[PDB]
From a paper:
The tail, which comprises the tail tube and tail tip, connects with the head through the neck. The neck–tail complex comprises a channel formed by stacked 12-fold and hexameric rings and a 3-fold symmetrical tip.
The adaptor ring, which is formed by 12 copies of [name], is assembled below the portal. The structure of [name] comprises 3 domains: a β-hairpin (residues 23–36), a two-α-helix bundle (residues 4–22 and 37–54), and an extended C-arm (residues 55–68). The assembly of the adaptor relies on hydrophobic interactions among the subunits of [name]. The assembly of the adaptor on the portal mainly relies on the electrostatic interactions between the electropositive adaptor top and the electronegative portal bottom.
Author numbering:
A (entry chain M), F (entry chain N), G (entry chain O), H (entry chain P), I (entry chain X): 4 to 68
B (entry chain L), J (entry chain K): 24 to 54
C (entry chain L): 217 to 301, 320 to 374
D (entry chain A): 268 to 301, 320 to 374
E (entry chain B): 321 to 374
The structure:
C-alpha cells in the first residue's frame, strides 16, 4: 500500500532529523504538530500486518525433551 | 404469622407457590 | 409403537402386575424420584467442577512471555534459545539469555490452583448427602 | 454463590491488542485458523509487540466465609425444626 | 443477552475496553461471634442453657 | 460513512507529519487545537463498529484437548 | 434535539482538526477556551440518554447452563 | 429560575467552543477567567435541585426474591 | 543498506554536537524536531538485525560442571 | 417440583436430556 511507504519515509526522516516542525519566510509561517516515535512504529506495524505482503509474526513456542 | 405475609422488608412478595395436589405437581413434568 | 392392556390381578386373585412405591399424599398415581431435592445442585456443581478444571489447565499452560521488536523467529532464537536449523525449544539444561534494552523476559505467575474450591465442594456434598440420605463420608 | 463462582472461574485470561481478533488469537493464544478453538496440548510462550499484552486473571476465594454463615443458619433452622444440628446438616 | 456457562473463555479487548472481576468481603465477618454473645445473653435471660437454646 | 474517510485521512496526515497547528500570513493568523493519537484511533474504531461494513472483532476463544 | 447535532459537529471538527483556538486579523483578536475529548463524549452520551430517540444501553447480562 | 437558563447556555457554549477567554481590539483588551466543566455541572445540578421544577434523583433501591 | 550509514552518521553528529535544531537567515527560518538517543540506538540495532551483514547477538549461555 | 422446571433463574432451561432406553443411549457409541 502507498501508505506504508510514506510511513516508512516519515520514520526515516524523523530518525535522521529532517522532519520539519516549523517553516517561516517573511510574513508567511506554518507550524505542524509532532508525534512520538512509538505511535509511528505501531502505525507502521499494524499497516504492514494489514497488507500481509510478508510475515514477521508467528505463534507461541513449544517445548520437548 | 409471617408465613403467609409479605416478609421482613417485603422480600417474599413474589413467593406465591400454587396450592395443588401431588399429582398436579408431579405428572406434568414426570418424563 | 403399540400398547398392551395388562390387568393388575387375574380373575382367580393371583397378582399379575406388581407396582411398589411409597405414596406421599392422598391421591398419587406414581412415585417421585429422590433426586428432585438435589437435582439442580448436582448439575450446577458438575458445571463448576468442569469450568474450574478447564480454567486451571488454561492458566497453567502459559509459562512465560516474550517482548521484543525483532522478528519472532529471531526473538526466540536470541532469547528462548530455539534452533531454526513456531520453533521447538529443547528442555535440556538451564539457560541465561542476553537482552538488549528493547527486549524483555517475563515469567508468569498464576493464582492458587485450588483456592477454596475444596470447602465449597464440601458444603455442596454435605447438602447432596442430606438430600439423598446417604452419609457424607460414604458419598464424598 | 454457586452461579457467581462459576462465572468468576469461567474467565481464565484476557487478550489486549490493536490487531484483528483472529490475528491476535493466532499470534498470542496460539489458535490455528487453517471464535477460534485452541488445543490444550503443551505449554506455550507467546511473543508480544509493545502494543500487545497478556493478563492472567486472578479470582477471589471460591468459599470466602460462606461455610460459617451457612453453619449459623443451619443451627437456627435445626433449632426451629427441633432436630439436632448434626442430623440436619 | 444470555451467556452460556459451558467452557472457559479468553476475550480480546481493544484499548478502550476493560473487564473487571468483582471481589467481595467475607460472607461471615465475625457475625458468628456476635450472635454467640447475644445468644448467651438471651439464654441467661430465659433460663435455658446456652447449648440447648443455640 | 463520510466521516470515516475524513478520520482516516486525518490520522494519516497526523502520522506522516502534515497536520497543521498554526497558519499565519501577514496580519491574519489562525490556530487550531490538537488532539491525541489514541483518541483519534478510538474514534475511528467506534466509527468502524457503527458502520458495520466489515467485521474486525470476534468473540472469546475456546479450548479443547 | 438541536443540541445533539451541534455537539456531534463539534466533536467531528475537534477530531478532524478544524476546531479553532484563536482568530486574529490585524488589531482584532479573539481566543476561545478548549475542552477535553472525554467531557464532550460524556456530554453527547448523556444528551442522547435525555432525548431517547434510540436505545444504546441495556441491563446486565444473565447466565444459564 | 433565570440563573439555570444562563448556566445551561454557558455549558452549551463551553461544550461547542464559543466561550470567549480573551477579546482584543487595538488598544482595548479584556481577559476573563475560566472554570472547569465539573464545577459548572455541579452548579447546574444544585441549582436544578433547588428549583425543584422536576425530579431527577430518587431514593436507594430495594431487593426481593 | 543505505539507511544504516545515514543512521550511523546521524548518531555520530548527535553525539559530537553537530546536529542542528533550528536554522535562520534573516527572514528565512526552519526548525526540525528532535529525537532521543535510545530511540536512535534501537532503530540502528534493529536495522542491523534486518540487514544481517554481521552477527552481534547469540543464544543463551550454558553451564557444565 | 423444580426438577422438571426451568430452574432458579432459568439456568436449567437448556437442560433437556432425551428420554430413551439404555440401548438407545449405549449402542450408538459403544465402540
Amino acid at each position: 500500500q502507498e501508505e506504508l511507504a510514506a510511513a516508512r519515509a516519515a520514520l526515516h526522516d524523523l530518525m535522521t532529523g529532517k522532519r520539519v516542525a516549523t517553516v517561516q519566510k517573511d510574513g508567511r509561517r506554518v507550524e505542524f504538530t509532532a508525534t512520538s516515535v512509538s505511535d509511528l512504529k505501531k502505525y507502521i506495524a499494524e499497516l504492514e500486518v494489514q497488507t500481509g505482503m510478508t510475515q514477521r509474526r508467528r505463534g507461541p513456542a513449544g517445548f520437548y525433551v | 404469622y409471617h408465613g403467609g405475609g409479605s416478609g421482613f422488608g417485603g422480600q417474599l412478595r413474589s413467593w406465591n407457590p400454587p396450592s395443588e395436589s401431588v399429582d398436579a405437581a408431579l405428572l406434568p413434568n414426570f418424563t | 409403537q403399540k400398547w398392551t392392556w395388562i390387568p393388575r390381578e387375574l380373575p382367580g386373585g393371583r397378582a399379575s402386575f406388581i407396582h411398589v412405591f411409597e405414596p406421599v399424599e392422598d391421591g398419587q398415581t406414581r412415585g417421585a424420584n429422590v433426586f428432585y431435592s438435589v437435582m439442580e445442585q448436582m448439575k450446577m456443581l458438575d458445571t463448576l467442577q468442569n469450568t474450574q478444571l478447564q480454567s486451571a489447565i488454561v492458566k497453567a499452560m502459559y509459562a512465560a512471555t516474550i517482548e521484543s521488536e525483532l522478528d519472532t523467529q529471531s526473538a526466540m532464537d536470541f532469547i528462548l534459545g530455539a534452533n531454526s536449523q513456531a520453533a521447538p525449544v529443547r528442555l535440556g539444561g538451564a539457560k541465561v539469555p542476553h537482552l538488549m534494552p528493547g527486549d524483555s523476559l517475563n515469567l508468569q505467575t498464576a493464582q492458587d490452583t485450588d483456592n477454596g474450591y475444596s470447602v465449597f465442594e464440601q458444603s455442596l456434598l454435605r447438602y447432596i448427602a442430606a438430600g439423598l440420605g446417604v452419609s457424607y463420608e460414604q458419598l464424598s
